[PDB]
Amino acid sequence: RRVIGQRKILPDPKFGSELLAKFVNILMVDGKKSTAESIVYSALETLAQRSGKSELEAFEVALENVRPTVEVKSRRVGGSTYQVPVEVRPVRRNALAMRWIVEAARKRGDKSMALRLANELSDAAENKGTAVKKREDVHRMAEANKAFA
Amino acid sequence: RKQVSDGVAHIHASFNNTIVTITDRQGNALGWATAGGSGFRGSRKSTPFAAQVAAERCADAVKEYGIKNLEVMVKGPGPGRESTIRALNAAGFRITNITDVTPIPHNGCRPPKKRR
RNA sequence: CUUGAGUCUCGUAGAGGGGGGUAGAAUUCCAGGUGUAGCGGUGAAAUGCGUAGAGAUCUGGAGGAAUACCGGUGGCGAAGGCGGCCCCCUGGACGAAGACUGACGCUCAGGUGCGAAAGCGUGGGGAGCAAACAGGAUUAGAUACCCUGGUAGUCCACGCCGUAAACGAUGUCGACUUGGAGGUUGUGCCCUUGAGGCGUGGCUUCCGGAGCUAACGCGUUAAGUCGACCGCCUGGGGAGUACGGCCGCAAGGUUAAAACUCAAAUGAAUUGACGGGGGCCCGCACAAGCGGUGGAGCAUGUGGUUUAAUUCGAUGCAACGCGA
Q1: Which nucleotide is nearest to B112 (CA to C1')?
Q2: Closest protein residue to C282 (Cα–C1')
Q3: Do strands B69-74 and B8-13 pair parallel, antiparallel, or not at all (unpaired)?
Q4: Is B79 within 7 A of strand C by CB distance?
Q5: What residue ranges do the domains of chain A occupy?
Q6: Which family does it belong to (chain B)?
Q7: Nearest alpha-carbon partner for A24 in A43, A5, A4
């Protein structure tokens, strides 16, 4: 029954990006802010080294194709467990997109986290990888069986 | 055979079965197929989807007469039998009237006993 | 003497009974067609109609069977009961006025009569439906459900019997009773000033007022206060049972015990649990996300195993880094 507003997070103190601060918080474990920053900032600078321009919108144009639009949420009504496909909120779409982006960086197969994530940013920019695979996977499980919707 | 394009349909919506018969306004039989005549038996034949598929395998084979508009009346206490007439409407049989001519007894025949 | 009881005049509602046929759906049968591989019914299946061609409807007809639509805790009757349609004989209730009899009235053991369904005899039909019944399908027996069929039987006349939760578990005839809302049959007064409001008759249905009851409850129709008459009961089981009498083609019925057993049996209404009902909410209880137990090695406890002894306690969320 409880309801509250989203946690007041401080935006990124370098680029001023609350949605990217949410990402660098999703990724951070054991609270290692210093090393996490030192790897993600270097990988995003490696993104400027990748294309050769002011990489600020490249993040958005990459994530525009890893955001889901349909999700299944199980709800048992009428005997069996129905699937009840429900739309996903854009503020949650960004979170899920970044989640799919980070849940494939570790198994890339590059030398270091910063390097493999800088590579995976450009990879998801052109619609490849486990992130885009899971995006298509959730796009096909939901609303393609509209008989239950 | 001939061109009809406008007829009538009489259904027997039984409890565990469903009969259909299409007629051109005078008693000629055009289309008819039950549930138990297409390898569909058991409770699988007792579903409205069975009425759907019965309507379908009637329509795809009886268009030799070319019916586009259709009259129909729901008859019998059949569970979920407007589905088959809506499938006829979806089978290219543009419906014209939906009514009920269920023959109710006039205490002329004593109603038989039922499950105790 | 005339108010009870009756008699006269005219109308109202009508499913009270015979006798007769009558129309519609339906559904067995018959024939003709048009058309095609299927129908028919089970939580499944099978039985059962079909390749001179099955069902299914079109045309018509035979068969018997009861009247949905009005249909209504709607009307009628002493009760038991009556529903399409009309007639003859009637059986009963009510209304609007005016007139006569002289108490003629109510109850009533025997007795007589009527009397639900089931159960019989005689003579018939019996389409469909349906006690018994052949048989099929899951089957060391299904003889029990489920499915097509089916004998009486429902139907038609003349006669047999008299039993029911035949209940409003409330016998009949009466005298005096505060209201509301309707069901049904009335019709008067004054202006019918579109079906008008007030008084005056009945029969009733849902609530409650004093009153009564053990409570529930009844409450102008009393289980309210009283008058007259008839029947029934004296703990439960045996038991409405044997022996009798009468009735009966038969079933048995009516009247109607005793020896023996027990110390209870029984109605209402609270407070309770049944184990699921039915509904309303909390808790990371769930769904979304995090690291986890379970994969591996190592520390530690538990049961087994082992032993001369391997000291004891502890065990489902609450036993196992617990006593230590």
Answers
A1: C129
A2: A1
A3: parallel
A4: no
A5: 1-149
A6: Belongs to the universal ribosomal protein uS11 family.
A7: A43
Contact of A67 with A99, CB cutoff 8 Å: no
d(CA A78, CA A87): 22
**Neighbouring C-alpha atoms within 13 Å toward the C-beta of A136:** 7
How do strand B18-23 and strand B29-31 relate by DSSP bridges? antiparallel
For this PDB entry, the determination method is cryo-EM
Q: Where are the domains of chain B?
A: 1-116
On whether the CB atoms of residues B23 and B55 are closer than 8 A, the answer is: no
Tokens read off for A21:
């601060």
Q: Closest residue to C27 by CA to C1' distance?
A: B109
- Resolution given for this structure, in angstroms: 3.8
> Residue A19 CA to nucleotide C309 C1', Å?
71
**CA proximity to B8, closest of B19, B22, B29, B20:** B22
Q: Is the CB of B43 under 7 A from strand C?
A: yes
Indicate yes or no: strand C within 7 A of the C-beta of B1: yes
Beta partners for A82? Answer: A75
Strand C close to B19 by CB, under 7 A:
yes
In total, chain B counts a number of residues equal to 116
